[PDB]
Design a protein around this ligand. Sequence first.
Ligand SMILES: Cc1cc2nc3c(=O)[nH]c(=O)nc-3n(C[C@H](O)[C@H](O)[C@H](O)COP(=O)(O)OP(=O)(O)OC[C@H]3O[C@@H](n4cnc5c(N)ncnc54)[C@H](O)[C@@H]3O)c2cc1C
Ligand SMILES: Cc1cc2nc3c(=O)[nH]c(=O)nc-3n(C[C@H](O)[C@H](O)[C@H](O)COP(=O)(O)OP(=O)(O)OC[C@H]3O[C@@H](n4cnc5c(N)ncnc54)[C@H](O)[C@@H]3O)c2cc1C
Lengths: 473, 473
Amino acid sequence: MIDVIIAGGGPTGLMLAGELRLHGVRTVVLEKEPTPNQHSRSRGLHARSIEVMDQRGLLERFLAHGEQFRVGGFFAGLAAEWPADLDTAHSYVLAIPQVVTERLLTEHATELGAEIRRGCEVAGLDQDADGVTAELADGTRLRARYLVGCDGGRSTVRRLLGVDFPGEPTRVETLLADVRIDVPVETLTAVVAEVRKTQLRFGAVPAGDGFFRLIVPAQGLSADRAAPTLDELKRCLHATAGTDFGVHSPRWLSRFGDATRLAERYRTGRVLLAGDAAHIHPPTGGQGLNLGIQDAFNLGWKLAAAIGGWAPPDLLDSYHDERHPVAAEVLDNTRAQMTLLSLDPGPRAVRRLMAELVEFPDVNRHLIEKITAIAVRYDLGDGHDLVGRRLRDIPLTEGRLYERMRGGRGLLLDRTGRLSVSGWSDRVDHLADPGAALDVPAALLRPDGHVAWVGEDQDDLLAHLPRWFGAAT
Amino acid sequence: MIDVIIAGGGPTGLMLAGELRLHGVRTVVLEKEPTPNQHSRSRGLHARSIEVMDQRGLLERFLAHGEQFRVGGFFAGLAAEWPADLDTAHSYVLAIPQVVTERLLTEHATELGAEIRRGCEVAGLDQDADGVTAELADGTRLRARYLVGCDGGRSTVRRLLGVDFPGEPTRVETLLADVRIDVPVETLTAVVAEVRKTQLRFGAVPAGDGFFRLIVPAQGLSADRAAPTLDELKRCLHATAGTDFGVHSPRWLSRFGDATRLAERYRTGRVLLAGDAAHIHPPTGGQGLNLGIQDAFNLGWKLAAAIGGWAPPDLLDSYHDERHPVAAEVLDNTRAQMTLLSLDPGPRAVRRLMAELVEFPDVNRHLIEKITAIAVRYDLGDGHDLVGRRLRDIPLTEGRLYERMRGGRGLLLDRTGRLSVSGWSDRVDHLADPGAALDVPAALLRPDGHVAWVGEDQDDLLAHLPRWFGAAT
Ligand SMILES: Cc1cc2nc3c(=O)[nH]c(=O)nc-3n(C[C@H](O)[C@H](O)[C@H](O)COP(=O)(O)OP(=O)(O)OC[C@H]3O[C@@H](n4cnc5c(N)ncnc54)[C@H](O)[C@@H]3O)c2cc1C
Ligand SMILES: Cc1cc2nc3c(=O)[nH]c(=O)nc-3n(C[C@H](O)[C@H](O)[C@H](O)COP(=O)(O)OP(=O)(O)OC[C@H]3O[C@@H](n4cnc5c(N)ncnc54)[C@H](O)[C@@H]3O)c2cc1C
């Protein structure tokens, strides 16, 4: 029997598939497209995702396929420098196109034994006390214990579950086009800089083969929501830039709206949602793929614990509880960034103010910690300030913390010489290293790297172990 | 002959009148209303104005008539605490009603010998190479050397000069009403707090005689711009608060718009503009009266120098040059604050972000330094960071710096034991005090307290003296 079916083999589904396979969960990914999508949305990973890749031994291959940037501009285009003191060992943006990210994640899930089935479109579902059935559009059916809808912003699974998707509708649309041009790049660049004085929803990024990615505001809102024609792209370039640059030969035409919507329940019985299936928002700040990877990283070890039979009874519900608030904050911060890009005089004045404020290092750091997700803190109810936050990478006596996390178990980082995870050692590794560079006596880490407990008293540690790791054996 | 006619005896005109009388300028204020206005707009003075009053020996009487506050909320209502480290010796808001401010300024101008003429409405003007004629609406005429329009936001003088008043039109109107209510104050307070969760353009402030000042958004924009009726106030209270509180017996009804307009030229020959006559904007942050007092404080000693015959040829033009940019920044910051009060979801998201940022002390300080005008810096072209800024009050060996400024002359604060203002001592006092708590060798202060020069070399000091103080005698 299949343990988990994943509907959708985008970055979220593929990441989830890898996390599940770490625990020997039998995982089948049903991806509707017969061949990988060739057009990239995402342009890169942010620090929390880069950390996550390094905790799973994937960072070397991501670095080998991308370029590291430390530049300003990630929060609503607000120019700065990169913050000097961001609290991560991975303080950069990894520019890497989404197609490449999906290739790396695909090759990793496949090598861990996930079964990826392309050309398989989930059309229907049926669940009961014991499992879930997925019905494919070709009439075939698959049974598993759980089903996770990782099937993007127009998720079939979300619709079939009848999960509400409340939020703000699209009010502002933007065109995206991969096109050739008929002006020299220096001419394109000169005009773009003049426009971007005021309209920051505009630009042109070379693909390095003579094509350019043009971003240009739409005129109004479209009834269809269909992709724009070349004719509409030209009208929009004329309106914003005063020229269409002789654009021709499009190889991709797209439109995106600024709606911010969040699934009301991430879990419905044995079916969950993750990634764009659970939340949509503007690309301002480059956050969605990152958010989805982190959804998968939250969910995977929990679902694995439930399949393994040791998950405490509330564990799976803690996926919604922790991740739904996080997405709500991304959605809000993208509403704020879109307002900072508005040409209306009030917003332009607020933008000038924000430009003054981001010269303060605390502000610049705050906005980038927000964007890059390194300061996410779940409410795991304790006082100690580290509890609920992920722990950054730190040097050990030999090596580093993230090197020890590649199995995806919990980890007790113990500097006291005195604690013990006996009873849970099959689920929690004991990293007994007084030399570790972390100024607490000990920290219990969940498999997602978030701190569940900080302290130095064995009895207290025994009290917190079952919450995340179930019963002693 | 009259030296200066001031059109308008509001706070700006009255302050200007006092500054001029310090120098024996013959000053006549033509105020159109026969009796003082009884309704207050302004609720208080900000730190730069409080400093200015203390440099002119008026602070004791302002403090005796007002209440000192150190509370958050002055930038778009963003709750904080008052910033701990604001760079002023006068770190507070002086709550004092505008009527009282005008009384104090009137009694001060009158005691210095300004001639205030109430019931005198400027209707027309005529200037030539030698002077200006003001024509009053009763057909009488007065001649002076200069005329300053201090005649408010619908300035007659600005209109007669044909000075453009460009900017953003009113898009958002607010009602103001001094009314009695028919609910207990605790009920009023409870509803206002519920509304102010989201609508911060709403409130109710007791006058202490059973009347309340109610602030409530208008519905739309009015064609007349006329004062609202009680009926319109009720409609607006119902819409915003769900109740009109039984408001009755209005003693004042007003409406104000959010237009931001700035006179294109502060000076037209022998006629200048100051105060609301030169700029209008929202009351967000409580800045207009303050800005006007500071306009007068910039202009007065300069006009006095021109009347006295020693002003360098560019001096009077430096009023426009210095003060026009300052007003432009107030106008912009009020556009930003109004946006932060908008109920639209984008602005609400930007407001939540700003609420996070103002917890950083640098941000809170930055916004309050902006509001209170203490960080205004004129471009007087040097490098030294103090040049162009006002100098805060500082302790002397005995006493304090602001105690020595009450004559309204320049002031060389010299710690070196070696400098000299000989040649200019009738215009610049030499405060030779190595014990003064200021970490520069010496600072030359203009009569408005702004630093013209910092250094320690007599020859260099001689080079900068004529720019502000004319030729040696
Ligand atoms: C213009 C733009 C730029 C962006 N830039 C960035 C960025 O720089 N950084 C960032 O982090 N994010 C970025 N994003 C957001 C990012 O692209 C998405 O958040 C990311 O694709 C979400 O991945 P996902 O796996 O959840 O969903 P998707 O990538 O949509 O994948 C869903 C998968 O489901 C398959 N599927 C759909 N229906 C079914 C079905 N019924 N059965 C089976 N399979 C199905 C689809 O074929 C697809 O492969 C950007 C978005 C836009 C529009
Ligand atoms: C609701 C509200 C609240 C505010 N709160 C604050 C605050 O807390 N702090 C702050 O600093 N500012 C505040 N302001 C702004 C403040 O009231 C004004 O900036 C201030 O009144 C400007 O003074 P002024 O002397 O330039 O003009 P005004 O006070 O308008 O005075 C102009 C004078 O000119 C006279 N006049 C007009 N035409 C003629 C003519 N032809 N001949 C002769 N005389 C004439 C008028 O009678 C009047 O006395 C607020 C404004 C509003 C609407």
